[PDB]
Structures are given as structure tokens and as C-alpha cells.
């Protein structure tokens, strides 16, 4: 029956942080 | 500053470990695991 | 000049500063709560947004739903009197004097 | 070591559980919380009394009956320690017990530790004399009074 | 899934018919009645808050 | 025990001295970025690596071998190889071993996989 | 789901709600019926009808039962307790609050307490707490007073405060004003019969709920009501509260009350000093803990404040003013005075402390050096009892 | 619990052990109506007439 | 000092009574046990040896 | 004065002297004794953790009904009961359960007394009233609930709850005991064939192989599962213990796994790992510690 | 930069000990009283008697589950 | 009345078995239990009484 | 962990089987004291040791 | 004597501060250490007397 | 009423009948052949309240004495029917005292003669 | 003093005693106030649970 | 032996056998059992609680002065558990007339909250005017600093749900962490009414916002009233919100989810009468809530159904 819901989009979680810094 | 230094160190070590792998094994290929047949 | 030997030097400086601020803020709420500190477990809090990522409340177990996958070691340890240790039920935790 | 501390964050981890929390096994140190109590402990310990914090775990020991039982069981009825009267027909409940010394032998120094010949009989008669002295006492109204000072006793 | 979920019955056969083996456990006299004394996570949280 | 994305970002900005983040990604061909403060022990080597002495381990991997008290966070593309590696680290008895599932894919938004395994079973 | 019509029952039984013994599928139904609990019929009948409305309203008002409830009320007002109780029996539905009010009010004059209590307890936590009402509790309390029953007074007070379940979950909690009234007659009774314990309890409650000024608030409230019917603005000020006849008059009496406190205390001190010796006067009475009052109004209020100020003295002087509807301040001055004095006396811990009787001083001891009795001990003698003797430590 | 012979080697307690009595008795609740407190009186009029 | 009578049993414990006297010792024990509530007048039982 | 001295002695935990002062008072000054001496003694005994005395003094104070107990009194006594109820015993008494919980079952009796005495139960701290309310919901039930509490629906619902929390071990219906404990041989005879007169289910800790006979920590180093033979067993037991070591691996393991840079060290007792290692190339200085 | 070279102290002291019994230490087993069997009688289709020891039998068991069996002085 | 013949409260526990010796031995068990518990309670009451005898207000 | 401490306890229990209860004297005070060499004339000299 | 009294008040104030802190601080309570109560005392805490001048 | 009850029954761990001075050393006797020479006791070690390292009587393998408060059972001697010697404190208040006829006329220490004298 | 500011109450009390403005009960009043029982209230409810 | 099995308690040939306890052995209890003590279950009845208030409690705190002063006006408004039938026009007239005379803010607002609640129970639509006339200026408009008393907010919200009103969304939004932070103080009944209204009106986005806050604020999910959850979920037709609602559905409990399905199947079913406004057809959300229920329940084995078409193969 899987996948139940659409997987999270490809978004990159590290970039915004190290960019602020 | 430290992050910069340590990043570069990381890749240096990765580079060497990989080169050691290819050297000692003789090729760049490896087996899978018995469970990668399925 | 020997900072970088220490935990307040270099890459860890930022952590120290963080810990520092939290402590301050935390002191404030203790002073507000009558000098009886909030829960370590942050069971005390209105919102889930509020409990920090550093709290022991956050659930790290192989499984959320399946009880047999909720142990710390290889089998399920029991407390005195063969009481469940691993994941305690609400009434087994008693905060008494 | 893994068994001891596996995912353990602090030694106090399991202390959400009251029966684990007041265990005195590792020491008393997690049960002392305010200064007051610490000082009290110091004081009581110096006077040579018990620590009150120690009482957080209740230890009933083994009851004397259980001990005597394990002894007489391990000795298969322990005949070394029984009065010879245990070995004769219909012993009363006092012949049924072990051989402890009572308070009645206390003032007789004639018999030293090994009593010589006839000494123990003599002692036995002294003991009787005292029992009769008690009887006369009760009869005529002179017995110890729990209140009495020294002149009264005299 | 849960490894304490365990067959209490034997494979169906005539051995259930032809034999005086009992089909359930006899009641256990000293096991108390199960009853409800206990609170939720939610409730404990409500009290603390 | 798990470690979630929140914990991961927090540990990026606020590292702990004796928490180690260990990258398990196996093939160098697939790894183009560096998880901050991480170290590289590829999954394939683990069983051997963990049986080296402190010195030997230092010589083979070029970084200090985590003590058995320290926090060890494991990392992979999907969170599969990191899991298997975790089992290795747990079998030598390491007290705090956390796997970060969804790890490098969630961090960097890459879609890669440690092993090719598919959900569908071949009809029996 | 099965539902029984009590109007339409036929031999045919169209809805097929009966338990048919031989039909298809019957067996498990029969078995269910034979397993039913001791009250099954009764409980189901009662819970499928008679349930709280979606608004939080009580089921209490029904057209077909109304004249019966009316009749009960009517009967209770003429004081026929038995006839009323005999009609209460035939009630199918929850009876309205008014019934419980009437019924307990009827229990008061003959002192029936057991009956008032079983009435109340019947309407409460069986019937949805219709019975929990300012007025009903008030009657309960008036019975407990009338029956001179101390423990039951405390019990009604306790019921009135309630607990989380009835206050928060059920939402039946006695009104603020009513709470005040109840606690107040309980307090009259206790202070008048000298029960320091329970008095202190109720008083501490009044302190905690900020009810100490409540009677004043109510009077101010009434004048405000009239001023709103006239169209003029109302406001709550310290000036408006000190413009009240109550506060004025208490302020007037206060010096006289103080002087009585002082006279009384002096005489107590004197008596205690005499009983000390078994009867002349001991040194005990020569200087007491009470300071003499300066000659002024403000000096009086200051004196009251510093010796008796753990209690709120002013509000006590107000409460003690009326007794059984008779105003004491404006008719019997000395009776009022003695009352206010006695109450302020009972309600302070400070007063309790400064009124104590001198007790003999207990000798410490050591065990005998030559052991004879464990019961005989060497006593310590204070330098007063043995003059001479070598110098000793403490 | 220290007795290794308990059912195996034939030792069966003649008296039920204190610790067990405590556990048994501590498992079940106590009925409130068993405590028997009457300080008010008997209700002559209302009690037998209460809601159906 | 507590040890005033010590000489009478030298090096053995101190006693306030003559320990060399059997009767006086037995008497002293009697009084001790009377003082502590172990001995004294108690309601009789059918088992206490009435004779 | 005397009640302050008692309160001091009792905060110190000195019970003998506190009780002495009260005795002297009782004897000479009795008509003057307030409740606060009983309060002092209660607080004190609770500190010294003597709960039987904490009880004795309350029962006495209920007998003489004067001086009147105060909400503070009731609070101290109740607290002492909760304290008692939460203490553990030593390990000898801990094998089956935590005994001292029985103390909490005193509570609904004490509460009843508080109503006979006119101590309002709603002057009790919020804290204590939480602990007490808990204690209640453990042991108190009404005649109403009692008629309905054994219904099978509720028994099985309780079982279902235990199943979703994965604790079935103790439940009666829901556990199947398997292991049998064999008899003890005698050197008085191999010949005598023993047979079982009776059978009881008792916890395994009564007779379990002595810790020095069995392998070291079993829970941690061995994965054990009790399971049933699938094949038909002519005779012998239908259950066996499948025990494998935690560290067990296929004897063929090295083929089952990808090749490593370690492989050319095969069958070598003391390799120089310093030589195949990467540190010696990476470092400029490279001190070899050996 | 580096100003110094140092030797790494750590306090490894275990001074506390927490061991918790795993669950299966308290699980039930079936234990039995055991006496020497003096004789046995089985009956299902046909009765069969075995006598190991002839003495006056002080105890007797009867068991009906598959076959009727009677364990004498068991 | 004095001695054995008088009391404030009487409890009679009526025990019932299927076999006579069962009920006999149960009665010994329960009996010894109540002996101990009884002595404990009555001893407590006794100390309360001795204190009330020593003195008290009204 | 090897359970050798538990063994040691068990073995102590085994050794108990043999032992008597000691003779503590008819006058126990006197006896204890004389064992310690305190009473008058009860002094023993230490056992003579052969010099090294 | 007066000076000694004053000084003793100071020291007590310092220690008091320490005590309030320990009794309210739950993280430090988590590690179970009697040594927290003795590792800083009047001698150790600030203000230090021999540092007064500067 | 044993001699030295306190020292033996309440003071000593075995109740006097356990021999605490015994070596767990291996014996050549046939019954003791299971007994293995024990390692020496662990040096700084924290025991469980019911055990000891087994070095001395003061430190047994098994701690028999409870750690609570000990109290001798309440005397069964009648306090109300017993008449003690008259104290100073009692004889000063003798005019307020309520006694039994047996208290006033008591054979030893009669209080009536004192009320009069 | 009742709120636990004794430091601030000390000079005031000194100056009163110097002017002989205090009499018998007043002292008892002050000394009792040194026990901080408005602080005691706060501690009792928050800290001491 | 037979089709009727022996019952092991009454049969001595079981009871006294070798596998049980013979009547000649000593009959004591074997082992103690502590079940209820070790792991205890929390009480949840199959039936809902009979005394619960079942409404939105509006928390009337009035100073006992104006409480007496305003009595003839307040006697017409709801007191605890009592709902007088006074027509709402009259009550609003009384507020408009007499309220400017009272000087207290707190009093005027408690009084207003009573008026709102009263108008919520009669579903009179002209009561929002009162919000725009008095409250809007100092609470909702142009970043006014003032923070309304909780009871007033609860009352107005309750009114916007009872009378379905677009207005609620503006008020609710002010209650989150950056605004008044009132949301964690809401009752379970509050959430219930909110969800039901929003569902009828048909805002998927309102539904999402509200479910998110409920979850974050730790509302009591399982005791949110099932009808209102169903009516809310039924409103969701948009692809993204739909995704959200699957992932979210995993927050309910086993039991809750089973009755979400039962209630859903009834409201479009037999019990379609039970609603004042009929549901709208969502076949997708219906199917999904059923599917979810099936996933989360324990699974049963019906082999003749699964393997109906199974044929073996020799490949
Ligand atoms: O769970 C339930 C059960 C029953 N009801 C009952 O359904 C009747 C009509 O069902 P509705 O649910 O359509 O009415 P509503 O929204 O106007 O009702 P409120 O909940 O706002 O009062 C309502 O008047 C109420 O009595 C519920 O509202 N919820």
C-alpha cells in the first residue's frame, strides 16, 4: 500500500544555515 | 575557521583511504553483500 | 593564547555561548516559578514548539509504535518487583518529596 | 559496562521511580538535598548514632526464628545444642529449645567456668533458695517497686 | 509482530474430541480482578503544568 | 536510538567536544559534500576498524577512535548502511550509538541509496 | 438499535425488540440476557432517558412532570415534610433545583439534619448535582447549626468548597456570594461557641478568597443597583466603600473595642498570675506583653494593628455587629463589645501566644552513677533552687 | 524466596508468608461502604423515599 | 566517676551491687527487670501455671 | 515554650527527648496542652522515618478528641503515610513486588476519620491532595462499581491495553508457560524412578542454575529464543532453546562481504598496521609510537 | 594556532552500580513435587499393571486425560 | 463483663472447604495471622490508653 | 559477573554445617573480659617468636 | 571578638548563597554528588579577603 | 530473659549461632569438597544493605540486624492497678488527687496517712 | 523583616531602641518578624512543595 | 471425551491430577500475583462521562459588587448550567443602554462575554456588531496593544462557530504564540465547536491551521468530539491539505480512528438525519478515513478470502 503520502520535497537543510553564518 | 580546516582534512583522509582501497584490492570494483541479490 | 586546547575556544566557543544564554533564560523562569525549577523533562510546558531539542523528553527509540522495539539494551530490563523500566507508564513515575 | 550504562544520560536516570530513588545501595548522596539535612547527618554520625538517610531503604533483617531454623536444619536437628531432656519422653516446651545461658547463673562465682564436683548441685540449690525468696516477697508485699529510690530499696 | 502473541490452542483435530484434556485454563484463585487505576501521559502533563 | 533532523542542525551549529558524527557512506563516487564535523569510516570496513587498538585505528583512519562512553552518531544516504554500521558499533559495546535515518539525503537534498533494495517482493 | 415504545406495545411487536426464544440468531441474545448485571434493566432505562442536554442545561424541566414538582414544592412550604417526601418518590425525571431548596428549607425548623443531608446527597452526584446550590447548601448549614453539630458544620463547609471533579468537570460550583454567606453563618456559630480550630480554618479560607470585605461589597452593590435604575454612573472606589454605613460605624466603635480588648487582657493576666501561686500576686502580672493605648483615634487603630494585626480586625468588628437579626452596636453596647473582643481574641495566634499561663520549668536529668533504677534519675538544679554549691556549667 | 527447595524438594509453607499476604492484600481495592461511619442520625422521612 | 566500684571486680565490668553475693545479684536483676516492665503484676491466664 | 523546644528536638530527629517533654507536660500540666505538640511529634517521627509512631500518635489524637486536630495535623500524618508507601525494602523482599504500597491503602480509612473529626479535607496542600487522590484511585471503590467490575469486557479490555504496551508476562489467560523443572537426583539410588505428585507455576528465580555454573552475562552476550520444533518429535521435548551468540557470523563471512583494504593481512598474527595505514603519508613528521 | 601539548586526563570512575534484572528472570516455570513411584495402572482399551515396588501405598493419583492412569504411591 | 466474656466488637469468620482437613488447617493459618495482627493493634491501642491515663484535658 | 562472590556466600553457608555454638561462659561478662586479658592475673604474655 | 563576628557573618552569607543555588539547581542534582556541597565553601567563594585591596 | 540479650540477640548479627570467623578456604573433608578458596574481599566497595563482604562479625556475609528503630514490646504489667512509691510531685498535689480506696489505704505506701500528715 | 529584608530593618530598629520608643511587646513583635513569615509563605508554596 | 469439553474448575479429575494440586497436599497459595500494581491501566469508559459540562465554560469572575449591582440585567443571561429563554434583542438593548454607566473594563467585558454566549445559544446573527462597536477598536484594529480578557475571546469565538461566521479566522489568528497566546487555554469543547463550524463552511485551510495548532498546543485529540472531526475532514478537497490530513490522521489513537470511521459512515449513512446541515459528498476522504482505520487496527486472518485463487507452481 506504501507510500502513504508524497515524500518531502528535495529541500536542502544545511545550506541556509551555513549561508547565514 | 576551524570548520574550513577540518573539511579539508576530511577530504584528505577520504582520498587516502580510497587510494589504499584501490591499491590493495587491485581494482576499483567491490562485491556487494549476500543480501544485495534481492 | 592556549584557548584552542579548551572547550570555550574555536569551534566549541559557539556552543559555550549557547549554553550560557540558555542558563540565563532558565534562571529567569526558575525565579518566576518560585525558585522551584521547571521539569528537566520539560513535561511542564504549554507548547511542543517550546521544548528544546536538547530535552530528554524527545523520543529516540527504534520505533514509535511497537513496544518490543522500545528497549535500551538487548532484552527488556525490569525495576524492583519486576516493574517495567524501559518506557515508564504515567503513574509509575512519581514525583514525591 | 554496557549493561551498567547503555544509553544512560545521568546516574539519576531511573529516579522517576520512587523505589529506585531511595535505594541506599550506591550511597546516601542523592538523598541529601538541603544543607540542613547534610548537617544533621554530620552531627548524628559524629555522636555515633545512625544516619536517618540510611533508613530510606527499609531492611528488616532475617528474623531470629528463621535463623534458628536454618541452624537446626543445617545441623540436622543440632543434637549437640539440645538439653539432654529433649531426649527423654514428653519434653515440655522449655526442653524444646536450644542451650542459651539465662540470667540465673549470674551471681555464683563458686562454680567458675568448669564447675567442680557437686558445685552445680550446690548452685542449683542456691537458685532454688532465691525462687523461694521471691515467693515470700510476693506473699508479704515486699517486691521490687519500679519507682523505688535507694533507701526504700534498702 | 508482538512475540508474546502466542498460540493458546492446538491445531484443530479429533484429539480435542476424543480426549479429556481441558480447552481453557482453570481460573486462578489468587489473581486479583483487573481494574483501572492509572493515569494518561496527558493527564500527568496537565497536573504538572 | 534515533537522532532527528533537528538534532542534526543543532549539532551543526553547536558541536559537543565528545560527540562524534561518523559518516558511513560507502562509495566515494557518490559523496560530494561533507557533513560538518564528521569523520569517515565507510560501512564496509567497520567490523575490522572497531577491532583495532587506539593507535592502529589512528593510523588507519587518521582520527581518534571514539571511547565507548562517547556519543556516536551514524550517517548514510538513506539511513540503511548507517543502521547496519550501528549494529556493528553496538556489538562492540558502545554505549551511545545513534543512527540518523534519512541522513545525507535529508541534509543535502540528494536522492541516493546505500543499497538498491526495492519494496516489491518477487512473486513466489 | 432497539428502542421500546411504552405506548404502542402490541402482540405482533412490529419493531421486533422483544427477546424471542426460538427465532434465527436468538441464542447469543439469550445468552447475553442471562449474563446481564444486577441493575441492567433499571440502569439502561435510566440512562437512555434522563441525560444532560447539549447546552449544559439540566434535563430537569419536563412538561408532563411539572405539576408534580409544583405539588412537592407547595407541600414543603406548608411544612409537610412527609407528604412531600412521599411525592418525591413518584418522580420519574430529575426534579428541578427549586424542589431541593424547598425540601431542605422545610427540614430546618424541626432540626432534622439526617433528613436534610440525605435529601441533599440524593440530589447530588446521583442526579447530576442538581442539589449543589448556594441555597441548598445554605439550608444544610442552617440545620447543622440548629442541631449544634460541629463536625457536620465543617462537613457542609467542605462540600461547599468542592473538588476538581465537581468544580471543573461538572461545572457545578457554588456562587461566590453564597459561599460567603455559608461560611459566614458557620463562622458565627463557631466563634460564639469558642471553637478556635474550625473557626481559624474557615477564616483562613475567607482570607484566601479575598472575601474579608465582602459584606461591604454587597451593601455598596445594592446602592449601586438603585443608582443604575436611576441612570447615574456607578464605580467602585475606596471612598465609596468608606462612605458605607457599615465601615463608618465600625470605625466609630473601634476605640471602645480596643479598650475592651485591653481591659480583658489585663484581667486574664491578673488571674493567670494568681493561679500561678495558688493564691497576693506573683511577679508574672507586673509587666505584660500589651502596651498601653495612646489617647487618640489613630493611636487606637495603630495599637489594634500592631498587637492584633495578624487577623483583620476591622472586618471582625463588622461581622460581630448583628446577632439573630438584632443589631447589637445600636442597642446593647456592652454585649456587642464583649462579642467583638472575644472573637478578635479567638482569631489571632498572636493573642493566643500572649495569653498563655506560666508553667513550671522542667528539670533535665542524667542517669544514676551507681545504677539502681533506670527510672530514677539525677535531676539538674537551677542556681535558683540550690544557692551555694560549687560553680557549675549549663 | 531464598528457599531453593520450595516446591522442588518438598518444602511447602504451612503458613502463608508475610510478604505474600502483603502483595495479595495490596492488589485489590477496598470498598468504601465497608468503613461504617454514622454520626448524623437515621433519616426517618426522606431516606426510604429517595429517587427511584 | 562511674568506675568507683571497679576494684570489686577488677578489670571486669563495673557493678553497683555486690556481685560476689548470689542473693544480692539475683535481687538486683529482679529489680532491673521490674523497673523495665518485664516483671510485675499482670492479669492471669489459664496457662500461666496457677497451682 | 515547650512546644517550640519539641519542634526543635523533632526537626533534629531526636524523638526520645521530644516525647519526654510531652510526657512531663501530660503528667503535670495536662490541661494546657495544645495541638501543636502533637504536630511537633508527628513532624519529628516522620523525619526520623518511624512511621509506626507517626501512626500511634495520630490514633491517640483521634481517641482523646481534644485538643482538636488541625488541617496541619492531618497533612503531616497523611504525608508520613505517603512517605512510608514509597520506601523500598532490601533485595530479599523485592523479588515479587514492592510491598510497602499497602500503606497507601490506609488512606481511605484516614480520610473517613477526618470527616468524623471535622477536619475539612479541602485544606490539604494541592500536592498532597494529588498524591492522596492517586492513592484513592488505587484502593477505593464503591458498592456501585463493585457490582460491575468483573465483567469480561473490562477484563479483556485491560488485557488489550497490556497488549498494546507489550507487557503480557504476568496476565493469566494470556501467558503460556512452557519450561518444566526436572527433579533432583539422589545418590541413595539411580534406580528409584521419580514421578510428579503435583504441579505448580512458580517464578524461575526460585531454582535457577547458580550464577557460577552458568555462562557470564546471558542477556547481553547471547540471543536466546524459546521455540517449538516444526518436525514431528517422536519423544523428548517439543520445545527447545535456540541460543546463538551475539557476535556469531557465517564461517564463510569474508566472501559474503565486499573486499577491504585489510584483506592482504589474511592470517597474520601481528600485522604492521602502521605500514598499510594512511597516517604515515598524511603527516609530514610522522613519529611511529612503536 | 597551537600553544601547547598535553596529556589528556579523564575520570573513568564507575563508583555507582546499577544492574537491572532482565524480565525473563521472573518468568514462570512448572515445578513439581517428586516421590518415588511404587506402581502404575494404565487402562484405555485394555488394562495393564506395572508394579515397581510393593509396599503399603501412602498416596494415590488418578489422571484421566488421554488414557486412564493411576500412579500408586507416586 | 470481665475477662473472656466481654467486648465492644465481635467478628466471626466462617471458613468453608470441600474437605474437612482443608478447613481445619486453614483455620490454623488464619488464626495465627489474626493473633499477630491483633496483638499489634491492641498493643497500639494500649499505649494510647496508658498515655490518656497519665493525663489529659477534657 | 562470573558469580564467584555468590559462590563464596553459598560455600560459607556450607561451612556452617560443621560448626558448634561457642561456649560463652557461665558468667558471660567475666568470660569475655578474661578472654581479653583484662581481669586481675589474667595477663598472658605474647608467644615468644624466634628471631630472624 | 567583634571583628571575628563580622567576618563570620560575611562567610556565612557566601555559604548561604551557595546553598540556595545547590538546592534549586536540578541539573547539578541529577549527577548525585555529595561533593557539590563541600567543593566550594567560605574559603573558596568570592569575595576573597586577601584580594580586598586590588 | 537470656544473659546479655542485647549483646547477643540484638547486637550480634548471627544471633550468636552463626560462626562469622570461618575461612571460605577449601577443605580436604569429603562433604566440603565443593568449597572453593575465595578471593579476598573487594577494597573500597559499596555493598547492598542486606549484604557485607563477609570479613568479620561486624561485617557478615548476610546482615541479619534490621536498620530501623528497635523497641521492646509494651509491658503487659498493669500500670493502673500497680501502686508506686509516692513522689514529691505527687504528694504536693495530694489534695487534688483522685484515688481508689485501695490507693488511699494501700498496704505499702498508703496515701491517706500522707494526706493527713 | 517579614519579607526577609532584615538588612534594611536593622538600622530602623537600632534608631528606635536608641530613642526608647520600644516597650515590652514591641520587641517580641520585631523578633517574631525576623522569622520572615511572608517569605515563609512563598517558600512553603513554591520550593518546599 | 465428547463434543462438550470438561470444565477444569469443577472436575476433580482435573483439579486433583498430577498436573494440578491434589486435595491431600497442603493447599496454601502457590505464588502471589501483583497485576494491578505492576502495570496499571488508565480508566477509559466505553460510555462517555455522564456529568461533564458539555459546552464552552465562559468563566464568570465578576467582583462581588457589580455582581449584585447588575443582577436584574444578568439574571437574564446564562448563569452556570442554566439557560434562561430571554429573547436576545432585549439583552443586547440592555447592554447598549446600561453598560456605558458602569466604570470597570473588566466588568463591562465579562458582561459582554455573557451577552455573546447568550446569543450563541439562540443563533442570533446581529451580535457581531457588538464586537465592532466596543472591542474591535482596542483589540483587533491597527495593532492595538491591549490584550482582551480570555473569557471574552472564548465567548466571541464560540459565537462565530455557533453562528457560522467568516469572522472567526481573524480572532483565532490573534491567539497564536506571537499574539495573545490564548490558544493553549482552550477547552476540548472549544476545539470541537471550532472544527465543526469550519468544516460546514468548507475551508480546507482553516481546517489545516486549526489541526496544526491543536496538535502543537497539545489538545486532547482523542477526546475531541468525533462528529466535528469528521465534518472538518469531510471539507478537505485540495491535494496538499489532503496529504496533510493523511499524515495527521496518524496522530489519533486506535480506538479514536475506528470510531472516526464509524461516525463517518453513519453521517453519510443512516444517521444523515442527525445533522442540521447535511454532509457534502467527499468520496475520497470517506474512503481514506476507512482505509486508515483498516491499516491501524489489528489484522485478522481469513485464509479462504486471501488465498481464494491460489494455485501452486512447479517452476
Ligand atoms: O456528537 C453530537 C451528537 C449530537 N448532537 C446534536 O445534534 C443536533 C443537530 O445536529 P448538528 O450537529 O447538525 O447541529 P448543530 O451543529 O447546530 O448543534 P451544536 O452541536 O452546534 O449544538 C444538535 O442540536 C445536538 O443536539 C451534536 O451536536 N453532536
PDB file of N, CA and C in Angstrom, chain J residues 264-285:
ATOM      1  N   UNK J 264      44.767  -8.314   2.602  1.00  0.00           N
ATOM      2  CA  UNK J 264      46.083  -8.855   2.324  1.00  0.00           C
ATOM      3  C   UNK J 264      46.845  -9.062   3.612  1.00  0.00           C
ATOM      4  N   UNK J 265      46.172  -8.806   4.727  1.00  0.00           N
ATOM      5  CA  UNK J 265      46.716  -9.120   6.038  1.00  0.00           C
ATOM      6  C   UNK J 265      46.301 -10.510   6.490  1.00  0.00           C
ATOM      7  N   UNK J 266      45.638 -11.253   5.605  1.00  0.00           N
ATOM      8  CA  UNK J 266      44.978 -12.514   5.961  1.00  0.00           C
ATOM      9  C   UNK J 266      45.880 -13.488   6.719  1.00  0.00           C
ATOM     10  N   UNK J 267      45.368 -13.996   7.840  1.00  0.00           N
ATOM     11  CA  UNK J 267      46.070 -14.976   8.654  1.00  0.00           C
ATOM     12  C   UNK J 267      47.430 -14.519   9.147  1.00  0.00           C
ATOM     13  N   UNK J 268      47.487 -13.307   9.684  1.00  0.00           N
ATOM     14  CA  UNK J 268      48.727 -12.731  10.196  1.00  0.00           C
ATOM     15  C   UNK J 268      48.518 -12.253  11.624  1.00  0.00           C
ATOM     16  N   UNK J 269      49.272 -12.808  12.569  1.00  0.00           N
ATOM     17  CA  UNK J 269      49.009 -12.555  13.987  1.00  0.00           C
ATOM     18  C   UNK J 269      49.326 -11.122  14.418  1.00  0.00           C
ATOM     19  N   UNK J 270      50.498 -10.620  14.049  1.00  0.00           N
ATOM     20  CA  UNK J 270      50.845  -9.241  14.371  1.00  0.00           C
ATOM     21  C   UNK J 270      51.179  -8.486  13.100  1.00  0.00           C
ATOM     22  N   UNK J 271      50.159  -7.879  12.483  1.00  0.00           N
ATOM     23  CA  UNK J 271      50.399  -7.108  11.266  1.00  0.00           C
ATOM     24  C   UNK J 271      51.069  -5.793  11.624  1.00  0.00           C
ATOM     25  N   UNK J 272      51.755  -5.156  10.681  1.00  0.00           N
ATOM     26  CA  UNK J 272      52.181  -3.791  10.948  1.00  0.00           C
ATOM     27  C   UNK J 272      51.159  -2.950  10.249  1.00  0.00           C
ATOM     28  N   UNK J 273      50.252  -2.419  11.048  1.00  0.00           N
ATOM     29  CA  UNK J 273      49.130  -1.687  10.525  1.00  0.00           C
ATOM     30  C   UNK J 273      49.608  -0.255  10.324  1.00  0.00           C
ATOM     31  N   UNK J 274      50.719   0.057  10.981  1.00  0.00           N
ATOM     32  CA  UNK J 274      51.408   1.309  10.751  1.00  0.00           C
ATOM     33  C   UNK J 274      51.828   1.426   9.290  1.00  0.00           C
ATOM     34  N   UNK J 275      52.191   0.311   8.660  1.00  0.00           N
ATOM     35  CA  UNK J 275      52.679   0.402   7.289  1.00  0.00           C
ATOM     36  C   UNK J 275      51.559   0.581   6.260  1.00  0.00           C
ATOM     37  N   UNK J 276      50.493  -0.214   6.336  1.00  0.00           N
ATOM     38  CA  UNK J 276      49.397  -0.059   5.373  1.00  0.00           C
ATOM     39  C   UNK J 276      48.526   1.152   5.676  1.00  0.00           C
ATOM     40  N   UNK J 277      48.717   1.746   6.850  1.00  0.00           N
ATOM     41  CA  UNK J 277      47.880   2.846   7.296  1.00  0.00           C
ATOM     42  C   UNK J 277      48.106   4.117   6.503  1.00  0.00           C
ATOM     43  N   UNK J 278      47.163   5.050   6.588  1.00  0.00           N
ATOM     44  CA  UNK J 278      47.264   6.303   5.851  1.00  0.00           C
ATOM     45  C   UNK J 278      47.967   7.415   6.621  1.00  0.00           C
ATOM     46  N   UNK J 279      48.215   7.230   7.917  1.00  0.00           N
ATOM     47  CA  UNK J 279      48.691   8.357   8.712  1.00  0.00           C
ATOM     48  C   UNK J 279      50.096   8.722   8.302  1.00  0.00           C
ATOM     49  N   UNK J 280      50.869   7.714   7.939  1.00  0.00           N
ATOM     50  CA  UNK J 280      52.265   7.933   7.636  1.00  0.00           C
ATOM     51  C   UNK J 280      52.465   8.786   6.373  1.00  0.00           C
ATOM     52  N   UNK J 281      51.510   8.754   5.448  1.00  0.00           N
ATOM     53  CA  UNK J 281      51.557   9.613   4.261  1.00  0.00           C
ATOM     54  C   UNK J 281      50.995  11.006   4.524  1.00  0.00           C
ATOM     55  N   UNK J 282      49.921  11.046   5.307  1.00  0.00           N
ATOM     56  CA  UNK J 282      49.199  12.263   5.653  1.00  0.00           C
ATOM     57  C   UNK J 282      50.033  13.243   6.483  1.00  0.00           C
ATOM     58  N   UNK J 283      50.664  12.731   7.534  1.00  0.00           N
ATOM     59  CA  UNK J 283      51.528  13.534   8.388  1.00  0.00           C
ATOM     60  C   UNK J 283      52.872  13.842   7.752  1.00  0.00           C
ATOM     61  N   UNK J 284      53.360  15.050   7.985  1.00  0.00           N
ATOM     62  CA  UNK J 284      54.667  15.459   7.500  1.00  0.00           C
ATOM     63  C   UNK J 284      55.782  14.890   8.368  1.00  0.00           C
ATOM     64  N   UNK J 285      55.601  14.985   9.678  1.00  0.00           N
ATOM     65  CA  UNK J 285      56.598  14.497  10.619  1.00  0.00           C
ATOM     66  C   UNK J 285      56.546  12.979  10.872  1.00  0.00           C
TER      67      UNK J 285
END
